[PDB]
Amino acid sequence: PKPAICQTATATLGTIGSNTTGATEIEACILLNPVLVKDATGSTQFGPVQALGAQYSMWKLKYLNVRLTSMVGASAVNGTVVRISLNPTSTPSSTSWSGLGARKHLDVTVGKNAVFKLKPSDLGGPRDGWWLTNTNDNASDTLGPSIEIHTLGQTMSSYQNTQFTGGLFLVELSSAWCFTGYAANPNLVNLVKSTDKSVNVTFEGSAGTPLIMNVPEHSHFARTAVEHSSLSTSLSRAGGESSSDTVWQVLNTAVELVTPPPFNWLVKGGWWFVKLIAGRARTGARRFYVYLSYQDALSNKPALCTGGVPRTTLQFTQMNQPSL
């Protein structure tokens, strides 16, 4: 399949903040699916990309350059390493830093400038190179790759050796999306992408039962999910509560949440998928099933806890518009 059309785009995606744990922290997670990039200030060039993604059925990338620009000199700060990596299926990983080293990646030391260049062979989809555009399909064929940025090592003011607060790098992305095949339904889609600057989250679960995320009822995120979550639903499991067919990806860059086992790795990884639970509800907050992957969410297979349970800035993306 040769492309019908190829569209280049360039965007500024925000800053990589400094490290306070000393351990691995996630600082960005960038979906490349053409209907999932967000058109906002700094990214207006993604408007056409979304439009094409809604009108064609197959996409691929010609290339992908991610540029890191130092916002702070090496005379000033010390101690932190930044790792840019390619997540090929956009599926959360439990392997932390050493796993990131297995993927195609670039490390840059604080106070330095760099460009992570990717060849088409690194990005290709399973349909003779292509991915599918419609995010209601089987996920292994739709979502395609993601760029993740992680930091390792406490960021210290190089003079007083105290904790440094502030941005280390500016992220700029440049790529070109190719499209072919005609959307059976264009969908015109307008998927919500927003941020909830501060909100309090809790987790409940029990042995054999689904991990649940609670969000206060009048938070911006709880608000937006209830407005935009499809009224069509499904039933998990048994007895077993109904959940919207609309999925949301959640990414937490606020530095520390605890969960029922075995899912400490997931919340520390910083991003997962959720579906809104049907409730009254009550008691207090809105409630969300948590999912280990997009296909798990599409298939109504939530994360199942091994036991009971022993502050955040959320960035969220509507993955989904059910009807299909």
Numbering used by the authors: 77 to 331, 335 to 389, 399 to 412
From the article:
HAstV is a nonenveloped virus with a T=3 capsid and a positive-sense RNA genome. The capsid protein (CP) of HAstV is synthesized as a 90-kDa precursor (VP90) that can be divided into three linear domains: a conserved N-terminal domain, a hypervariable domain, and an acidic C-terminal domain. Maturation of HAstV requires proteolytic processing of the astrovirus CP both inside and outside the host cell, resulting in the removal of the C-terminal domain and the breakdown of the rest of the CP into three predominant protein species with molecular masses of ∼34, 27/29, and 25/26 kDa, respectively. VP34 is derived from the conserved N-terminal domain (VP901–415), which comprises the capsid shell (i.e., the continuous, spherical capsid), whereas both VP27/29 and VP25/26 are from the hypervariable region with a different N terminus, which forms the capsid surface spike.
To further enhance our understanding of astrovirus assembly and maturation, here we report the crystal structure of VP9071–415 from HAstV-8 at a 2.15-Å resolution. VP9071–415, which covers the conserved N-terminal region of VP70 except for the putative RNA coordination motif (i.e., aa 1 to 70), was crystallized as monomers with 1 molecule per crystallographic asymmetric unit (CAU). The structure of VP9071–415 is organized into two domains called the S domain (residues 71 to 256) and the P1 domain (residues 257 to 415). The S domain has the typical jelly-roll β-barrel fold with eight antiparallel β-strands that is broadly conserved among many viral capsid proteins. The P1 domain has an antiparallel β-barrel structure composed of seven β-strands (i.e., β9 to β15) and three α-helices (i.e., α3 to α5). The P1 domain is connected to the S domain through an asparagine-rich linker loop (i.e., residues 257 to 267). A substantial amount of surface area (∼2,400 Å2) is buried between the S and P1 domains. An intramolecular disulfide bond is formed between C82 and C254. Additional disordered regions include residues 71 to 76, 332 to 334, 390 to 398, and 413 to 415. A Dali search indicated that VP9071–415 is a close structural homolog of the HEV CP in spite of the lack of any detectable sequence similarity.
